[PDB]
Design a protein around this ligand. Sequence first.
Ligand SMILES: Nc1ncnc2c1ncn2[C@@H]1O[C@H](COP(=O)(O)OP(=O)(O)OP(=O)(O)O)[C@@H](O)[C@H]1O
Ligand SMILES: [Mg+2]
Length: 385
Amino acid sequence: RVVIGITFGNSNSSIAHTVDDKAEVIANEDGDRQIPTILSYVDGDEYYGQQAKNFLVRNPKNTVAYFRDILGQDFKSVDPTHNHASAHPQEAGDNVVFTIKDKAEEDAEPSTLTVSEIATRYLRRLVGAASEYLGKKVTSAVITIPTNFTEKQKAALIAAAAAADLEVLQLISEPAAAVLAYDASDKIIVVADLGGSRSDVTVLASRSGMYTILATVHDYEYHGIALDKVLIDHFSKEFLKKNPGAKDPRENPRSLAKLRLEAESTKRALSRSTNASFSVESLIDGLDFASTINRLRYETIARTVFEGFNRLVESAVKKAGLDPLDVDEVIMSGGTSNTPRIAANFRYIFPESTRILAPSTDPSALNPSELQARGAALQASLIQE
Ligand SMILES: Nc1ncnc2c1ncn2[C@@H]1O[C@H](COP(=O)(O)OP(=O)(O)OP(=O)(O)O)[C@@H](O)[C@H]1O
Ligand SMILES: [Mg+2]
């Protein structure tokens, strides 16, 4: 057996392994450690990750994205909101499917593929990137999953992995994996996992080395995509003000795809510095756009989303029958937990006895985006030994 840990999310995925008792996240051949969970086909060639993400603009119909949560779902339960700008999920008997041109033709018929096949194809590429870094064929993984994954979805993921010739050793929860990454002593823990298409808040008790979940809140409205949108509307209004009579770039799918990508970029820049640029060439009707926004201004226009996150955490603690005083640690997980302001907002909500594990409010904090993959990798090694 050659084992790795895998986090497999609606927006990004990550791979990790353990060296000398320590987990390290593996960069793929694009140099990414946060690998977009997207598949795309151009001229019969298969792309995944960032190259696939980039094809959202010019090749949306043959790009499958935001499919993690669709795996194992009954078709009636599928919300295709986030697939609107890419391949649309379809009902085909008992399965949910995507119809995409994955053949070289040029007049070849489009393939109708199940989400399960999409996941298999993606996992193959994801594990392939692990194998290439290691020089050995990866055989087995621990994979992280949401706490609301149904039995059908758990089974579907296991089967999709098998079809990718990957042995699943264990499925552990996304929040559990984040706790593990921190090295894990009795305490009450809140994992605030703020992601792209979703946020999940989990309250866990640590009891004699064992974790039990006391309560969870799942939210599909307050997340990084909502933040992206704040920036998109902010700059679209600037563009329109600066270009009287020009068409609204949000109402043109191509212009909107370009705005999504740049806004995300700008957002992430503002997590590491206090000023950031936003620019798109040929945004719409041949017009270029360039502007800037500082962290203070961003936090102002994003405040309503930021307060959504507060109430999710508050809902969760109360759901567990607890009070903020009862919490010993808040672990900030997920890509959106990289946002400096959010750390500050939580540090305000919890008493000084509560600890806030985020890069800016704790000396021992880890990178929020690596927590899950690291935890998976650590669990895979514990199993191997
Ligand atoms: N440095 C950063 N600052 C702010 N946001 C970031 C940063 N890095 C990543 N993000 C955001 O995190 C979100 C995705 O989080 P994560 O990588 O945990 O995704 P995921 O768990 O695969 O997503 P999903 O919630 O769709 O399952 C995106 O909206 C992305 O723009
Ligand atoms: Mg996630």
